[PDB]
Structure 1
Amino acid sequence: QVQLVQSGAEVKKPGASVKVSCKASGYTFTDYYMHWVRQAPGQGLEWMGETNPRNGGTTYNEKFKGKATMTRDTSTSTAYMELSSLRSEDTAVYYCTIGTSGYDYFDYWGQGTLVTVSSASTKGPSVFPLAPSSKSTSGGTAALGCLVKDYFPEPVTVSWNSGALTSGVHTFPAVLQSSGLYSLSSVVTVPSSSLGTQTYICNVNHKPSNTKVDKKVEPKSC
């Protein structure tokens, strides 16, 4: 019931601004402080500040003061974190989190928003099927998947059959290509016996390019 839904990943040029949103549901918005947490490899996890949803005041971590501006809209139960004058060093995953037992712990977190600061323009991926064939069977198991090629920046999310297929799914960490573009694959192992009855669709999402691709992976007669 308690949900924190954040805005999607974005690519921003150095010097620009970005406003990340955190839509709250399943609780009375004014009951708990809203927190923002940064995650970047190296500096790791950092607490940026806490917003009082009643008076709208924020207690900031000195490190993020000025750079990050936190607000809340009580009419839409949405908290905002705005980063101004973006620099390469601001590339990170930004989480919103709340504590429902005074100031004891953080029990609920948003899904995170990856903000990428770069001069390179966004590029949507090409989606190619990795069709099951005699070359992708092992015992009575068939492997199939999708190849998500040439996108920028990260991330791409891949679901199978709109999230109904999760068992045996492996969405590989992205690889950086020579071109500066990323590539990844998402695979699943299924019974080879039911390739004639079951339908397998990879749902590819690249939020920075507003790319949404649904690819039906058809068995190969080879």
Structure 2
Amino acid sequence: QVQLVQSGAEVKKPGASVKVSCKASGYTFTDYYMHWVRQAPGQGLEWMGETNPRNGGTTYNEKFKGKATMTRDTSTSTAYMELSSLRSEDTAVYYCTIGTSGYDYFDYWGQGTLVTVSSASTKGPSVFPLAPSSKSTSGGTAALGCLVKDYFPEPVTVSWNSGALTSGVHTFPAVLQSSGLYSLSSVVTVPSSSLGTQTYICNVNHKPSNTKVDKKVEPK
């Protein structure tokens, strides 16, 4: 199984540098070129350049020369993308991608790394339960969730029961409060009959603040 596993979300002040990693597995790392793609608001998807994993040879999109530096470490099957002299415009999701055919039609992609460039203060969220009650029932079903309040920058990820619970989950887009802090909610609809036997835990991650919370949501 071909896998491209990227490093977590980062937040940097203007003028700083960041080095995003892409760990490859399930194929011979030196067989295929590693490509980097940017997804920035307004600018859309853009191909940044490619790295030959054998010699570390690189071809850049001219728009990214002097901004991006691509490297590789064959001993760990890891490709790297370093962004220098960070500015607000560098806030984007960065993807590593390969074309296993040996041609540049990309078939496998990393999960992406969100890099945010800001002078605003980083803040970890508070995680509060949205307990199932008679006010959150609908014809034998109960809704429950987690409120992920006051964080900066994006992203917050939420899973339920370590990824074993996905059906009926809605993880809402974050809202931006006047304070400049984000908030989001994640909910799930479950059988009301089994509230006493099943355990519901929301796993909340906010990498920029090293927040990693597993909140058990208790019925009311």
For 1:102 and 1:76, the matched residues in 2 are separated by: 21
1:163-202: CA deviations, max 9, x gaps? Answer: 0000000000000001000000000000000001100000
CA drift of 1:218 comes to: 0.2
For 2:207 and 2:6, the matched residues in 1 are separated by: 12
For 2:61 and 2:161, the matched residues in 1 are separated by: 42
For 2:118 and 2:54, the matched residues in 1 are separated by: 36
For 1:76 and 1:104, the matched residues in 2 are separated by: 23
How high is the sequence identity, in percent, across the aligned residues?
100
CA drift of 1:120 comes to: 1.0
CA RMSD of aligned residues (A): 0.5
1:15-64: CA deviations, max 9, x gaps? Answer: 00000000000100000000000001200000000100011011000000
For 1:75 and 1:29, the matched residues in 2 are separated by: 10
1:108-133: CA deviations, max 9, x gaps? Answer: 00000000000012110000000000
For 1:124 and 1:77, the matched residues in 2 are separated by: 32
Q: More deviation in 101-110 or 140-149?
A: 101-110
TM-score between the two structures when normalised by the length of structure 1: 0.98
CA drift of 1:104 comes to: 4.5
The secondary structure found in structure 2 opposite 1:153 is coil
Alignment length (residue pairs)? 220
Q: Specify the alignment match of 2:105 in structure 1.
A: 105
For 2:162 and 2:214, the matched residues in 1 are separated by: 9
For 2:151 and 2:63, the matched residues in 1 are separated by: 32
Query: Tell me, which stretches of 5 or more residues in structure 1 are unaligned?
Result: none
For 1:102 and 1:138, the matched residues in 2 are separated by: 53
For 1:160 and 1:103, the matched residues in 2 are separated by: 38
For 2:28 and 2:207, the matched residues in 1 are separated by: 29
The secondary structure found in structure 1 opposite 2:93 is strand
**8 Å Cα contact 2:98/2:104 also seen in 1:** no
The secondary structure found in structure 1 opposite 2:76 is coil
For 2:13 and 2:62, the matched residues in 1 are separated by: 25
For 1:104 and 1:52, the matched residues in 2 are separated by: 12
Query: Tell me, which stretches of 5 or more residues in structure 2 are unaligned?
Result: none
**8 Å Cα contact 2:37/2:48 also seen in 1:** yes
Q: Specify the alignment match of 1:125 in structure 2.
A: 125
For 1:33 and 1:123, the matched residues in 2 are separated by: 37
The secondary structure found in structure 2 opposite 1:63 is helix
